Design a binder for this molecule. Structure first.
Ligand code: HEM
Length: 154
């Protein structure tokens, strides 16, 4: 499931573009996630009134969440697979406190890739697409294993 050094370089180069506007990218990720998979939105009582894309884009609170999520994921990606320390608290909260179904991590991975195509079509070529897919697959695989270790089957 690992990535080569070259693959990690493609991942971190496109992530570098995300880092120019972490909150905005993160907002767009959550908009894609919530619109495409409304069951995910249901996990956020505070966002229940957000129905349209425009309403979601207008929400500074959703933007803050976008920043939270992509800040943590960026920290994980920069470790190039050596992310035990970063993954531990995230698995613990999402498995045992928030109880977020493991499938939703696939949905958010898809959403990240959608946003990268949307914002960076010139710089997100097929090699970067493949490498980013591998990186998100590794993250998902590792956090799914932790979910089970923690006793969360959802
Ligand atoms: C790339 C995947 C994700 C990352 C990096 C991520 C990151 C985080 C971080 C850093 C926090 C705050 C600290 C904590 O409680 O752990 C958090 C809180 C939370 N996350 Fe996630 N998250 C991810 C995916 C999801 C998904 C897919 C959902 C639900 C659909 C979700 C639901 C929550 C909820 C309900 C909270 C508590 C919200 C609050 O009370 O403010 N997360 N997330």
């Amino acid at each position: 499931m690992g990535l080569s050094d070259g693959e990690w370089q493609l991942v971190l180069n496109i992530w570098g573009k995300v880092e120019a506007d972490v909150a905005g990218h993160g907002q767009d990720v959550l908009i894609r996630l919530f619109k495409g998979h409304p069951e995910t939105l249901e996990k956020f009582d505070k966002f229940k009134h957000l129905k349209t894309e425009a309403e979601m884009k207008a929400s500074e609170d959703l933007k803050k969440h976008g920043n939270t999520v992509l800040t943590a994921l960026g920290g994980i990606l920069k470790k190039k697979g050596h992310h035990e320390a970063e993954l531990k608290p995230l698995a613990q909260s999402h498995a045992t406190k928030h109880k977020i179904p493991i499938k939703y991590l696939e949905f958010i991975s898809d959403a990240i890739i959608h946003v990268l195509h949307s914002r960076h079509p010139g710089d997100f070529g097929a090699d970067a697409q493949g490498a980013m897919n591998k990186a998100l697959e590794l993250f998902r695989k590792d956090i799914a294993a932790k979910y089970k270790e923690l006793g969360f089957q959802g």
